Design a protein around this ligand. Sequence first.
Ligand SMILES: *CCC(=O)N[C@H]1CCCN(C(=O)O[C@H]2[C@@H](O)[C@H](n3cnc4c(=O)[nH]c(N)nc43)O[C@@H]2COP(=O)(O)OP(=O)(O)O)C1
Ligand SMILES: [Mg+2]
Length: 160
Amino acid sequence: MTEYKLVVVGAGCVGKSALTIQLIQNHFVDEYDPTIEDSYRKQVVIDGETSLLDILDTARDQYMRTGEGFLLVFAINNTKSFEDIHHYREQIKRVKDSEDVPMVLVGNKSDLPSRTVDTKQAQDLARSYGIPFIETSAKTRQGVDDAFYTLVREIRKHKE
Ligand SMILES: *CCC(=O)N[C@H]1CCCN(C(=O)O[C@H]2[C@@H](O)[C@H](n3cnc4c(=O)[nH]c(N)nc43)O[C@@H]2COP(=O)(O)OP(=O)(O)O)C1
Ligand SMILES: [Mg+2]
């Protein structure tokens, strides 16, 4: 089976861990330790192809070198976390020495009403980067599979 090393990055408290845990364990862990940086593995079938996902939940430079695709996560109720996205993307470009790195922009906490980052803002940013944008809720699981599977599809497109 093919293996994909994915890396989840973004400001603190945006939901990187909650998203990863939903993908791996299929439940919403609300109070997860904010300091645990670790990799999780799960065998899934994506578009009929069996894949082993090796996902690093960031909170280290060994996985930025080996990571094949990156989830850029902000929270839709956290303007600063969206402003920080550019920093994370630039840091990945620097380590990869490349402008063509599979990435997906993720706007998490879509269940909340207290939104300060417009969907149009995020779509504008993703368009500028040339990457997909997916809105998620780790709480309700909305969009969680879509975010990670979309990233795998971008790595597959990249390799082909
Ligand atoms: C950082 C400030 C903060 O959120 N403080 C606390 C007060 C008490 C506990 N509570 C909490 O644990 O929030 C977690 C988590 O439940 C929440 N979260 C994550 N994803 C979602 C989502 O999709 N919808 C909603 N309504 N809440 C979500 O946010 C924090 C942080 O989650 P995390 O540890 O996964 O974030 P990481 O630092 O990026 O890993 C709020
Ligand atoms: Mg975390």
